[model samples]
Every structure is written in C-alpha cells, then in structure tokens.
Target: GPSAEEFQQLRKKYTDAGQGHVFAFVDELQTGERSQLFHQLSSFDPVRINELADKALNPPASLEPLPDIATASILDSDPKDLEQWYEEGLKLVAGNKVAVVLMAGGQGTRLGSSAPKGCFDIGLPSHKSLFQIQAERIAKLQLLAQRISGKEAVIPWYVMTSGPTRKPTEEFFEQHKYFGLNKSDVIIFEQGVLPCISNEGKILMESKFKVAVAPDGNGGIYQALLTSGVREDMRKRGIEHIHTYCVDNCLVKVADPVFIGFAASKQVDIATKVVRKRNATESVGLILQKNGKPDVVEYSEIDKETAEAKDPKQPDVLKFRAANIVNHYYSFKFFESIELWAHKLPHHVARKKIPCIKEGTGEFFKPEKPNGIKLEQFVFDVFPMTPLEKFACIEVRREDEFSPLKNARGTGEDDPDTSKRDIMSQGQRWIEKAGGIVITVGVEVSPLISYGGEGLEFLKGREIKAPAFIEK
Candidate 1:
C-alpha cells in the first residue's frame, strides 16, 4: 500500500538520510501500526522541519516595539463612550452575536491530578468544580443575554481539549449534566497532536507500537476550528463575534460583554484584554506590535533594560506592561481567513524528558533529563497574522479578570489557595460596593448571583459574617 511506502519514505528520509537513528523494531514487535502512524503524520502539510530546527538552534532577529500611539489602549475613551461600548456589547450578547472558545487542552499533571485541568476543583467550602463554575457562569450569561436580545439564543461554548484531556472533559461535562446547559451548546473539540521528536528531530517511539506525542499548543485551535467543523457550525448558527480565553484563569469571563462591545465598537477584527504587570520582571508576555503587526513576546525574550524602559510622557510606568492574559476576541470572518496563511505560523520548541524507545534495541524507557523536544504553536502566534488596523487591545483590572490557577497547592503564587483567595476577595469587593462590610470569614460569590458585581443591589444593610457566601 502507498501508506506503507510513504512510511518507508519518511523513515528513510529521517534515518538513512543522515538525520536520525535507524529505528528498528524486531522481537514480539509492531507491524504496519508504526508505519501507519508515520503515514498519518506524513500526510500532514509540509512542516518546514528544518526551518523550525534552525530557529531553535539560532534565535530569530530581534523585533522592535511599536510607537506609543500605535500601541494605544482603550482607556483613552471618555466615560460616555465607555458606557456606550458596554451597552452595545451587552446588546451583541443578548442578540446571540457572540460565542466563546475556551482553551483547556492542558492536563492536570502539573496540578498533581490525573484529570483534565478544567475538571480540577478550586472551590473553597462550596467544593465546586472548575467546569461547574464556568458552566454556571455560561448559564447565567445566556439567561441575561436572552432577556436582552429577546431572541432566546444559546451562546455556543467551544472547548478545545487534547487527546489526554478530551475524553475526561467530556465525561466531566456529562457527569454534571453539561452544567445545566444543553449538551448541544457545549461543544468540545481537540487541539492537534504532534509526534514527539528527539534532539535530532527524529520521531520518538514510546512503545514498539506507539509514538510519543504532545498537543500542538493553542495554535492548534485554528486547525481544530476547521477539522472539527466548528467553523461551519458557526456559520450555520450565524455567530460572528467570539471571545477566546484560557481555562486556567479563575476570573476569566467566557462571555465578557464589555469585551464584546469594545471589540465591536472599535470595528476591529481581533482584540485582546491585558493587565499591567505588577512588576516589570513579571513572567508574562507583553502584547506589543512587531513591525507594525500584533504579537506577544515572552518575558525572557526581553532584556531588563527594555523590560523596565519607561514612556517619556507617563511617569512611574514601564514601556510595555500590557500583560498578555490569553483573553481575546475574534471576528468569525477573520478567524476563518487564518487558514489561508496559518501554515506560516512558527512552531516553537519545548524540552522535556520523553519516555521513548531506544535506537538499536527495541527497549522503551523514560530518560532522566532532556530526552527530546516538542514543537508547539501558541494560539497567540496568530496575532501577527492580524492586520495593524483591525487589531485592538484593552487594559483590564487584574483583580477583576486575571487570577490564574496553575501551581499544585500553595498559599502563594498561582496555587489553588491563592486563586480561591483572589476570587473571594473580589467577592468581598462586590459586597462592599453593594453596601456591606465584613471583616471575619472567607466569603464566596457565584457568577450566577452577580457577573462582576452588576445585579447585586440587594446587599445594602445586610449583616454578612466572615466566610459567608452570598448567592442572592
């Protein structure tokens, strides 16, 4: 078969062509299964493997920051204009003109769990799962939008999962009865997987019959949007605007109305929400323009001097602190156009110890250190593809929108304890705004009660004890 021949060709290209080791599987070994896999891998579009390797070996030339005027924020708008944008954003939400894409392909391995990241429970005494909290927010937002749009629309929730987390995520959703929303509206898709390669760019084998692999970063969402038929479904659903967010952010608004309105009102095809880094050296990417095009540069890619550089006009401010929080809006049309040139997106590399088969002997073992490299594509890599005029960025309050939960379990940093505390503190602020004072206990506020402290005018003159959760 051509599949077998194609596999042979690929293997020959890597092995016999002075590239990688000669992978020979004998003994109680595998058959066309390995070849079949390589066949599938080969069928993918040309990956420009050498180019990626070259970049990994020698970094690309430096990119300069854009002019201050070019990197302006949405904060310049007047109070009246801001109110109008918020109002218009709500209108879009109510009319079913918006959708959501949640980047949740990560597994819970880092969090010391075997489940999907979204299935982790960050709840305090309430013990609500992440999916439960997010789903409940969706339910509340849908109801609110229905009341506003008067059309009773179900805002589609597109969750991008990975091979390891995909099934668990779906099962979690089913177990929660889709978190009280219809299963049809809760769409789950997968990010693409890449075969793990060795330091020499060889396809690393896990078992005699299996190939080690990893999810191809968030950038795989673009491919998934096409392969999963989500784009066509969106076309059918007539959804135009989409808000993309990461699942790890505890305070992310999957269907943020103000975000929706701002993107639309600005008439931009893509928009991102950012927060000023608490410190110049904070480990967060900055959403800046390179060669007049938008993209994010990693913290390490910048020098301390550049990192702490200040604007001439603004005092006590770093030059580029617009921390990229992985929250964004995309016009469906602009997203659709990605495929036309999406192939040009760069594939980045990450070093990891991959348990793989040996070269001569058909033995599989996990190495102690840097066994191989995994090439990935970040979702934000698409920002560069966005045009200069049609892209937008806004500064958001970190306390309200950007607490992430990633560390295993700790009282400091992105640990679960800190995340819970941040949300609880946000809840306290909401209650305070509603005319309540509390000093004692940890209190929880569900998005079902108030989406960012909006509908909680009933908390005036209420005796709220410490550690009391309010749902009213």
Candidate 2:
C-alpha cells in the first residue's frame, strides 16, 4: 500500500491526468475500504495508462494492404508422415520435455454464469465441468505416453486466469483435488489487468473507491509468464516445447502428440492448427501471409467480394479458407524472447458497454451502448512476430478437433448444446470404429477412460443400449 505522501502524490497524478474522479469518494469510504482502495490505486502506473488512452483515441493506420496472400504449408501432408510425427512427439512427452498452457481468462457472462467459462458444464451426463474434462485428458495422455514409450511422463499444466476468475478457478481445482493430477503439476497463474478508459480518454471509475478494469487479452500471457515466474519454472523443469490452447474448446486435445510431433519434426518456432472455413461467410479469422509474413486477418476486415472469392484452381473452395482455431505449439526457446516482443504487439481497442457508478449520484448502472474502450492484445497478433518460414499452419478436421463452447444454449452456433452434441457424436463414432454398436443416441465417454478412443477393444462385439457412459 502507498504511504501518506505516496497516496497524495498518486492523487495529484490522477488529478493532473484528468482522472481525479477515481478518488472522488475516497473520503466517504470507511478506513478499511480506503486502505484497500489505496493498494489498488498504487498498483496502476499513471504514465502507462495515459499512453494507452492516447493511442486509443488517435490510433495509427496499422492495417496494411496485402500485396500477396499465400496459404501456409499444412502439416498433414501424408498419413505416413503423421505416424512419424506422432511417435516423435510421444517421445518428447514421455521424456517430460513438453508443457501445456491453457488460455482461460474469460468469464462465463456470455454463457449465463458468473464463474469462469472453464467451470461451466456443457450439460454433460456426468455434469463434469470443462476443467474436469481437460484434467482427465491430461491424466490419460500421460498414461498413453508411458504405455507407448515405456517411460513415465509428467506433462505440467499451466492455467492462466484473470483477476475475477483467479480465486474461483483455483478453488474449483482444489475442491476437485486438481482432477486427480499432481498438485505441483497443475500451476495456476493470474493474468494482468488494464484500466478501462472512457471515449474522452478518462479512466472510468466503477465506484467511489474502485477503478474499472478489464483483463488484458490472452496475449497477456506473454507478460504473465514473465511476472508469474512461469517462464523460470519451465526452465527449471527442462520444458523444451509448449502446447497452448484456449479453455473454451470442448474438443481440445490437450498436448496432442500429433500436433507436438509435427511441430517438433519441422523444427518450426511456431506451429498452429487451423480448420477450413465452413463457408465464405463464416465469422472467423483466416490464417494467411500478409506482406510475406505470417498473419491472421479477421473476417470483418475483408469485403464481401474478397471473402467470397473462389480459388482459381479449385472453383469449389474459397481462396481464403484457413480458419485459425487458437491451438498452437511453440518451442520454449521462442517464449524466452516473448517479453521482448510482447510490448510491440499492438493493443486493439474495443468499444464496450461498461457498468459504473454515476459520478455525482453514486448510483450504479450499466450502459446499453458502448461508453468506454476496453483494450486487448490478442494472442494471434504474435504470428507476425515470427517469420513466415518459421511459422506453420496445419489444417485439421473441424468436427473431431474444433468445437468451441461460446454462446448460451439455443441462442446460436458454438453454444453448449452444440458442444455437447459434438462430444457425444464423437464418442459414438469411436464405439462404431471399435466394432461396437451404439444403439442409443447419447453416449458419453470419459476422457479418463479414452483420450481419443484408444484402449476400447473391450467394447468390440458389444451392442450398448441407452445411458451408456464409459467410465473406467
């Protein structure tokens, strides 16, 4: 907390920066509340906030026209090559040279929940949270690595949460005993937060004593890793490669051997998994070369004609079809220098409807229309940091690998219903492939039992009925 002198200096600083309203009601707060507010205010850097606000109003013309856009070389070229990549990746996992990073800084407001998105259940029969499912996947994968390489593997999980989610998420994991994984193996860290600024470049105050703030984007992980000592921990653990993915993906294969192996085999600094755009009008970012550098341009950036343009050779396919799925592999060496490049990543300002207290009346209300700007640094912005030659993208089957849980049920696509549907369908298909018949529609397979349908031979020649749950 700040001393009396430091507190006065900070107040003067905010007043001079036209944000004196942050402490407008400080005198009205009780001693205990005032002390808490002092610490929160002391954590903010006045100079940095001003710089962010200035850029938000007067943004540079950062978008450049792409002279030539080329498709990235996908890793799934041959089935035989995939086998080699899988084995190589398995060895790395078995040797304990890989770590998994999860981007889980999102709240479940969009999903009608107050907790973290990872804690929400997508209506599974077992009522398992997303966190439980992923934890089981990691446990199962470790067993698979040991069985295949005959060497025990311990793949550490690094979970990144935000300020609002940190305590709840950590508590959830603890209550579940870290989902049967080693306590030390699952490391949870909180990402940094940035102040919300008004359209007129003033820091928005949420209440008399609290200043409004939002979590810095997923790209915030670069800075988070450094500050949280995760980078140092990785070095101490001898982690060579890292597989990072978002927590909202219901079908995410945590530390997938095939992806890790392909990236390691090519020896690329960065390897990303992408799925073909469902159609020309799909709302997703496309991974392509811009100015001869690896980059992803959001769907909104393209005009209708450009987005709908068909490939010259393949008349049936759209020219820009690669959809980035936020699943990626990075050599630990690349992250060693991530701090140097994190600052260079541009901060994207998004206008948002923020709720805050009315300055004079002290009444809190939520705005219908956007009243303030929330700044974020997207993770994919780092794609351009590495050279095109060092960056690679792999086109994967979307149905098997890319189901995202985003909106609320029945509202639209990417909702809980769709994610649950995808999960059950994949489970049923696995049974069918193993010479088993799923006469029922809802078949739930625990990740603890099968990471990807492996070790399911017992199901062969068996016709499962309704309410089938493969829980070993």
Candidate 3:
C-alpha cells in the first residue's frame, strides 16, 4: 500500500525530474477516485477498467476444467500445403524484418544458481549456456529463412538485462562471440529498475548512490520497449513484427512461421502463443476474453467457481481457458501505438523482494520483510486497449513449447528440475515419434541447431547429433 507522504514525494520526484507526461497520469490516479488508479490507468482504458470491475462484481463462469494435457496442434495438411505454409511463414518473417526480444534481466537465485538465469547451462552434456542456446536458435532461424528466400537476411537480437546481470551478461556475450551472431546486430538494453520500498512504501536505500531495486517483472516489457527506444529503433530499421519471449523456457518456439502467418492473416496487432492446461493442478495463467476483451487471468487469481465451471458436458472452449506461454508477436506499428499511449495503460502491482536503501542511515538495508509494490505493465495489458479485431491467438504444442526454468529444484511439479526433465523427455518423445532411436545418453541440443533442436529436427526429419559445432 502507498502512503500519502510517499505518494507526494513520488509525485514531486516525477514532477521535479520533468517527467511531466508520465507523472501527469500518475497525478490523475493519485488525486482521482482511487489512490492507486494511476497505476491502473497506465495500462487499462476506462472501458477495460469497468469490464474488469464487472468481472469482480458479477464473476463470470469458472474456467472450463483444465485440459487433460497442455497441448495444441496445427492441422495436418498435404506436403504442398505444408510447404506453402512454411513459405508463407518465411515471407512474413522476411517481410516484417523480424527481431528477437530476449527478456533476460532476472538473477538465477531460484535455480540455486549463482549466476544470471541466462548463463545457466541447463542443457545436457556440454551444458551450453542459455544465451548460447538462444543465439544458436536465432542463427538457425535465419538460415532457414535464407533457404526459403534465397538470400541472407539478418535477424536482429535484442537482449534486456538488468543491474545484477548486466555486466556479466555483456561480458559473457562478448567472450562467447555472441554465440555467432553479428556483433553489431546484437543489441543489449538494460531494463529500468524501480527502487524497493518497505511494505509501508518507504524507499529503501542500499548505498550512497544505489537503491536496492530489481527489474519490475516480465510484465515490464512495455516500459522496457519504450524506455529503450528499441521500438522506434526497429521502425527505423524497417523491422515490423517483433517476437518477444522469456529466457526461462527452453522450448520457446521463437518466431514460429504458423504463428506469424496467422498473425498476418488475421491482421492482428498482437498475436500470442498459448498452450492448453496440462491438468487442474498445473500452475499456468489462462488467456481469456473478459467481456469480449482479451486478458490473461492467472489460474491462482480465479475463484473456484470460475475455475471449475463447465458448459455442462462440452469441453470449455468458450471459457477462454487457454494457458499463456509468454510468447507474443507484435507489429511494430502496434507497439509504437501502445508506447504513445502507454501512460494511459494501467499498471499492475506485484509484491517482490526488493533490495533498497534505508533512509537517514545511508546504510544498505535488506529488510527481512515484504516490500512496496513493483509497478509493471503486462504484455497482455495492452490487449484490452487495442481493438478486439486486432487480437489473435495461436495454439502450439505445450511439450514442445512450454517448459519454463524458474525454480531451483523440483517442488513436486513446478520447479527447474521438473521443467528441465520435461524438456528432455519431450525431446526424446519427439525423436521417437519421428522414427528415430534415442539413446538415454546425456547430450545438449544447441539452440543453433534449432530454436527447438529435437522438435525441429523431428519435424524436418533431419537427424542432428550433439557435440555439434555451430559457428555463427
């Protein structure tokens, strides 16, 4: 919760800093009906706000029962149709001048890893770092594009790093030769850090010049995009569709063709990739249309009635219970529009462990308590602001597209160990499905081989073995 004095100070800081545009909205929220309304206004429109309020007031039906297995598959078609689809995907990639936005700002504390999450070597055998794997995938996608387009086209890679991992991430990338990406084309931008405050909303000071702060959250993508100037930068470079994904998920189908094609076909402003729920117990947010507006309501946030609702005997297709995998494609124009209207977008709050400075003492303080709200903007937050006609969803195989590395160890189900094992098992299953024999030997699949090496190999029928050397 925010205090009046703290709010005044924050208002003064923004006003004094000459961030009038940003603060203007903040002031409205603070002085208006609700003290926290400014945060909501930053991401949600009035209609959306009313709709969400309605959902709260008159809760809709619970989500349909969770899918038996988190999954979705594109329809099978003839080789020619498949080829055409692939070609269309390639054309969209080339035409849009695709760029990769890698969200890699968090520390690896949860993984029991002392380094950045992006530096973790969850891969088997060689234990290739996350950065290496992602870079390789980018390279492979580029190569695939070349095969389809008959020319080399660069796929710009943008990495968002934060205070903790900024230096190390940069150093690692430099030392590893960007894992074979064009040094110039690889852009690294740091996400903005917000000071951590006590649960009472007092800013925590860590050092003389530093405040204990953290990257807001994955939801900070919009702010990062705006502040980094990457959005405008991409427009200038003729880049249109930007593919954004988190680094924790090993099976991220980075910039898949079917997704891009669907986005293009639907003329969508924002296209999100989703997975069906694995089971009722799985912890994943489901994307739904709240009163006809696209929004992702986390499973935990939904009440039991909404969670267990069924359309009698039919599967809950209309429940909008599709699970979100955090992969999205956005048109550059759409992103720019959102940025221009970012101040109007509502801000969501998250209670996180933020290192901050203790006022007066000037000594660093790591309070063993909950801190102030971390202001963030979810990628989905923009969905409601855009025309419903501009939104689209594409389903992908969860096993091949959804393992997120977040926990340090297995916690029965949702841990890093579970995610890693799930990925490995999926890879093996895909290999077997493709009529290839997979030995239980440890081997690392390089992202360079494919954004999803085994799955891609299985789809393409190309056997790729590890100890594989991929140079740029």
Could you report the Cα RMSD, in angstroms, for every candidate shown? Answer: 2.9, 2.6, 8.8
Candidate 2 local lDDT, 1-472, one digit each (tens): 3467878988898788777888878878887777877888889877789899999888772333223222233343677877787888888999899999999998766677788999989887888988899999999999989997787799999999999999999999999999999999999999999989888787887877788999998889899999999989999999999999999999998999988998887788998888988998776888777765778887756678767878789899888788879998899999999767889987878899888887777888898889899988888888888876677777788888988887898786989888888888888888889988877656789998899888788999999885577897
What do the candidate models score in CA lDDT, each in turn?
0.77, 0.85, 0.63
lDDT of 2 at 63: 33
By TM-score, who's the top model here?
Answer: 2
Estimated TM-score for each candidate? 0.91, 0.94, 0.75
By TM-score, rank the candidates, best first. 2, 1, 3
**Clash totals for all candidate models:** 4, 0, 23
| Residue 280's lDDT in candidate 1 | 82
Worst 10 residues of 1 by lDDT: 18-27
Which portions of model 1 show Cα errors greater than 4 Å?
1-23, 30-51, 58-76, 108-110, 310-316
Please, what are the lDDT tens digits per residue for candidate 1 over residues 1-472? 4455666667666554444443465224456665555555464332454456556655663455544443445556577767777788878878777889999997655577788877777766677777777887887887777776677767889999999888988988988898788898879999888767678666677776566778988888888899999888888988989998988888887788878888887788888888888888777888887776787887746778778888789868887778989998899888778679768877887888899878667777779989788888878887887787788888878888888877788537877888888888888888888887777745788878877777777878786786877764
Clashing pairs in 1: 219-379, 441-466, 441-467, 442-467
Quality of model 3 by C-alpha lDDT: 0.63
lDDT of model number 2: 0.85
TM-score of 1: 0.91
